PDB file of C-alpha atoms in Angstrom:
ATOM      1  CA  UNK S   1     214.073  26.476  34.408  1.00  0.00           C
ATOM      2  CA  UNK S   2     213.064  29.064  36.910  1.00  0.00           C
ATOM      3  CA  UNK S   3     213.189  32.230  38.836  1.00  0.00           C
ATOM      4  CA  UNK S   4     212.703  35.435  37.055  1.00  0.00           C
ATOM      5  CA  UNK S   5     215.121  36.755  33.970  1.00  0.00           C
ATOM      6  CA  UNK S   6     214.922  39.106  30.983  1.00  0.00           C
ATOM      7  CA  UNK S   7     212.687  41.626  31.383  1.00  0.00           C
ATOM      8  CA  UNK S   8     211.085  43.200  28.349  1.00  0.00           C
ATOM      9  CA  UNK S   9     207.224  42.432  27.403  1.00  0.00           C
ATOM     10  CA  UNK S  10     207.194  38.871  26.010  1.00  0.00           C
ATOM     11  CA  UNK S  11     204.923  38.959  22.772  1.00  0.00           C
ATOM     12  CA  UNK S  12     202.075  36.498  22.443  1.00  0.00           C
ATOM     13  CA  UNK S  13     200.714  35.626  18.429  1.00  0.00           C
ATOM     14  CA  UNK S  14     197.643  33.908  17.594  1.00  0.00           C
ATOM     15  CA  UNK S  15     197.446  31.490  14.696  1.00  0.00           C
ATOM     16  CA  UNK S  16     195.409  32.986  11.970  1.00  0.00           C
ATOM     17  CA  UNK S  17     191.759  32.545  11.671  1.00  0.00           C
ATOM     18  CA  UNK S  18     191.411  31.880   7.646  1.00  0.00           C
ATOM     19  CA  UNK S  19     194.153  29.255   7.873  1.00  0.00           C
ATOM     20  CA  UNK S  20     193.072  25.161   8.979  1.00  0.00           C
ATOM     21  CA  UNK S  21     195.519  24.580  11.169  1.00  0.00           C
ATOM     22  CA  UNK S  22     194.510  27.218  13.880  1.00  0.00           C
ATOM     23  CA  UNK S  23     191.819  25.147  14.329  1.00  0.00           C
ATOM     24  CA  UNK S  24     193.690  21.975  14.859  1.00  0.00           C
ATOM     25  CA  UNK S  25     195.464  21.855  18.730  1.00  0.00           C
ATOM     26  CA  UNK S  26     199.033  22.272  19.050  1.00  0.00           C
ATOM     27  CA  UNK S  27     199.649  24.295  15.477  1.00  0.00           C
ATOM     28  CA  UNK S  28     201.407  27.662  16.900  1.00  0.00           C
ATOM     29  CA  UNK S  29     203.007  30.110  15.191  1.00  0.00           C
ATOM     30  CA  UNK S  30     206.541  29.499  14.838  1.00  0.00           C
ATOM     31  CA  UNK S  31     208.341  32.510  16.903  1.00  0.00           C
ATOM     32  CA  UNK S  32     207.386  35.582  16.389  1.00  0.00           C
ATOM     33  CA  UNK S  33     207.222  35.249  12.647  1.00  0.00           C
ATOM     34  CA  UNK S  34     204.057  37.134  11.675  1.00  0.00           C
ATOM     35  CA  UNK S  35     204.112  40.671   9.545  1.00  0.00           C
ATOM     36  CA  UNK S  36     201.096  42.185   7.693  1.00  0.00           C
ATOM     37  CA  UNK S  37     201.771  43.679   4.474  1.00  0.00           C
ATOM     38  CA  UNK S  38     199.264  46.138   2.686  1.00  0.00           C
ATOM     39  CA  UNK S  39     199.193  47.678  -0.683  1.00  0.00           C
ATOM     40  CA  UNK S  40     197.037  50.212  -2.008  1.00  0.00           C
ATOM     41  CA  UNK S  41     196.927  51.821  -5.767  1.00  0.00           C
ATOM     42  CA  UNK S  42     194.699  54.751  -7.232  1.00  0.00           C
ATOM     43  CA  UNK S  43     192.522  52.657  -9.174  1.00  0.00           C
ATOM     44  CA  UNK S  44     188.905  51.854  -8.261  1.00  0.00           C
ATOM     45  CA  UNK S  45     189.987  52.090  -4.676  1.00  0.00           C
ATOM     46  CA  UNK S  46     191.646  48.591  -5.656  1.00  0.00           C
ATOM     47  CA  UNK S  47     193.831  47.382  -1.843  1.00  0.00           C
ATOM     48  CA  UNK S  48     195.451  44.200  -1.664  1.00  0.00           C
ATOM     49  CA  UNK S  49     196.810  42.815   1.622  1.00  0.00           C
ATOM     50  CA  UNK S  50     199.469  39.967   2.045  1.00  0.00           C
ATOM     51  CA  UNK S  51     199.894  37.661   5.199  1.00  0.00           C
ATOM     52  CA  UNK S  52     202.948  35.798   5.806  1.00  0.00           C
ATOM     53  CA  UNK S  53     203.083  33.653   9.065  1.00  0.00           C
ATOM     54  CA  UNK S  54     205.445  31.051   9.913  1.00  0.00           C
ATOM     55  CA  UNK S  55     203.931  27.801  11.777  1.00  0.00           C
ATOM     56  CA  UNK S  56     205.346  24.866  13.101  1.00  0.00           C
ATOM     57  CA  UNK S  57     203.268  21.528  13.905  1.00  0.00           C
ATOM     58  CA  UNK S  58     204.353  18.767  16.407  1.00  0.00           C
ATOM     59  CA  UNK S  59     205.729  16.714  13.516  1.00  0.00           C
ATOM     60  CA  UNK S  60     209.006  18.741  12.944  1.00  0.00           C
ATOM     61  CA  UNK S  61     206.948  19.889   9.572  1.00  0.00           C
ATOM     62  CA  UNK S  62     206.583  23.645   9.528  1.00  0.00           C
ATOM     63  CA  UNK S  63     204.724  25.357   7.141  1.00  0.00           C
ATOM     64  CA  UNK S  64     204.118  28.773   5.631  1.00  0.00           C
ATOM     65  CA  UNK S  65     200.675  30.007   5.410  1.00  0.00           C
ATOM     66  CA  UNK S  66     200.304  32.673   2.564  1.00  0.00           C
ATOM     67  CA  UNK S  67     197.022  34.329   2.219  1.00  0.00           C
ATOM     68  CA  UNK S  68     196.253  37.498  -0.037  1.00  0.00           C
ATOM     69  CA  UNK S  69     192.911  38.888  -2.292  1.00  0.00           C
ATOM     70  CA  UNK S  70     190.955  42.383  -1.450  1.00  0.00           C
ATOM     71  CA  UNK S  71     191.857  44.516   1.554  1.00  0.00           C
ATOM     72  CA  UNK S  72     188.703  44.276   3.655  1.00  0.00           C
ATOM     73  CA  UNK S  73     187.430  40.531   2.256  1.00  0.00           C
ATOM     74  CA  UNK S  74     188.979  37.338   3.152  1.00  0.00           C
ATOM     75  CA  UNK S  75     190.521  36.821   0.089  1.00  0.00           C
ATOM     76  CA  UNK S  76     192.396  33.642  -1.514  1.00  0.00           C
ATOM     77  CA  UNK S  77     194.645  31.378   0.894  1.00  0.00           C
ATOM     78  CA  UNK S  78     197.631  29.761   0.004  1.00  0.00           C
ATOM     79  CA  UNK S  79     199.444  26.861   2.397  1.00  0.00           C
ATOM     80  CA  UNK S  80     202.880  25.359   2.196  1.00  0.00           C
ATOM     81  CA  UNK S  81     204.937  22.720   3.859  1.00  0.00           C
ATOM     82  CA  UNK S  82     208.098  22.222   4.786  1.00  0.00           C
ATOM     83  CA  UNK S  83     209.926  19.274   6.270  1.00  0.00           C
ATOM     84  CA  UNK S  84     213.445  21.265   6.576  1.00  0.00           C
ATOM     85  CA  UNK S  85     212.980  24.656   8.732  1.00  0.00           C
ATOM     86  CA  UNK S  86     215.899  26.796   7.473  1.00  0.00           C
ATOM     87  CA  UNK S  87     214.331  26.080   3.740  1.00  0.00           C
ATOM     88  CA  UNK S  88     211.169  27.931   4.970  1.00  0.00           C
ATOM     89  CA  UNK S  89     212.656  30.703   6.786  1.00  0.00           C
ATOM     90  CA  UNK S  90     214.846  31.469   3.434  1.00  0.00           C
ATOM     91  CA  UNK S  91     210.345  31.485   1.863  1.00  0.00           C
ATOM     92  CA  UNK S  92     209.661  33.826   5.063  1.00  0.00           C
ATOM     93  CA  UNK S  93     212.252  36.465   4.716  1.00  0.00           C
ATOM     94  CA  UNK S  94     212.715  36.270   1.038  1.00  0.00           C
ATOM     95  CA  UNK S  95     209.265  36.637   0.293  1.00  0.00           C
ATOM     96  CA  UNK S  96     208.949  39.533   2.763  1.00  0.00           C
ATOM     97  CA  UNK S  97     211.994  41.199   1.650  1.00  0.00           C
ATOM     98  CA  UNK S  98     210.606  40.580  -1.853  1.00  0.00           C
ATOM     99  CA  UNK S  99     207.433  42.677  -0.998  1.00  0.00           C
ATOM    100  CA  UNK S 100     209.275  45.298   1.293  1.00  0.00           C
ATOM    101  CA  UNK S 101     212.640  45.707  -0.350  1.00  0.00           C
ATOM    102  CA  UNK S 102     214.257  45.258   2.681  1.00  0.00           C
ATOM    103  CA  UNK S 103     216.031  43.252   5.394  1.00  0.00           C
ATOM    104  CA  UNK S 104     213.663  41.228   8.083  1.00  0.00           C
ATOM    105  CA  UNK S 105     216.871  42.189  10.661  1.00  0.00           C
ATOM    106  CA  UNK S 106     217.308  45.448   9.390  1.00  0.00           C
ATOM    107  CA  UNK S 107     213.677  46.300   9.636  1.00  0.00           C
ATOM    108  CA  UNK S 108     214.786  49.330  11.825  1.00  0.00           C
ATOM    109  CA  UNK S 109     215.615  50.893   8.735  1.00  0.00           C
ATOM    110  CA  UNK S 110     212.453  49.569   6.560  1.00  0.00           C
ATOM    111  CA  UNK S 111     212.166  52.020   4.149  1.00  0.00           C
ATOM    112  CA  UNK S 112     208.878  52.278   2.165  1.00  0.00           C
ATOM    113  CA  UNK S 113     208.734  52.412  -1.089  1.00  0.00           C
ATOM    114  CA  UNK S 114     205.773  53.834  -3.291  1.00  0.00           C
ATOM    115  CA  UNK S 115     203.788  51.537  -4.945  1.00  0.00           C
ATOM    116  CA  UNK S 116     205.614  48.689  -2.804  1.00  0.00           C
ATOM    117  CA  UNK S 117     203.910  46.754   0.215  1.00  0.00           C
ATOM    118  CA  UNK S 118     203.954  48.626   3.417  1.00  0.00           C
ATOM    119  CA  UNK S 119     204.199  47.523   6.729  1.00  0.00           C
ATOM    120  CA  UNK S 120     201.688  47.377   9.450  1.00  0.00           C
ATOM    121  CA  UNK S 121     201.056  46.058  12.872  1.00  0.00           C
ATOM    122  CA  UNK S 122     197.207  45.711  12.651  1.00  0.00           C
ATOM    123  CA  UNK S 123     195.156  46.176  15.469  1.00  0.00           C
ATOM    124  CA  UNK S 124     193.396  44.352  18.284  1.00  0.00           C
TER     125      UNK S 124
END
């Protein structure tokens, strides 16, 4: 484990504020597993935006964080656990293709729908 190798611009995430477990030391977002999702409607300027991150703790326990309410507020927060990782990946990407109608791997071709939840990249 050394020397230079694969270029690119590695990616750094930051454990969400809202959610517990940022707080507590070693909780880290599993991968790169974090897409905001937005969703606006024409009625009473009504948004809604919904969070999906993927942590992992040092207990071979991951679990999703889920938070959603009023774009602008802070909203409800949801948590889940779970012991096997695959089990919450199928949560991640099912979920998120449930919102987006479309592939996490094919996201090249993410295709937005009207009325459907959008995808964003937020900014620093």
């Amino acid at each position: 484990g050394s020397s230079g190798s694969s270029g690119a611009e590695k990616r750094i995430i930051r454990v969400d504020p809202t959610c517990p477990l940022s707080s507590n030391p070693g909780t880290q977002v599993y991968e790169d597993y974090n897409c905001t999702l937005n969703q606006t409607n024409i009625e009473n300027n009504n948004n809604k935006f919904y969070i999906i991150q993927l942590l992992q703790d040092s207990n071979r326990f991951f679990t999703c964080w889920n938070r959603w309410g009023r774009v602008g507020e802070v909203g409800q927060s949801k948590i889940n656990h779970f012991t096997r990782l695959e089990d919450a990946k199928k949560d991640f990407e099912k979920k998120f293709r449930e919102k987006t109608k479309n592939n996490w791997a094919e996201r090249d071709h993410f295709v937005s729908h009207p009325g459907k939840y959008t995808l964003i990249e937020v900014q620093a």
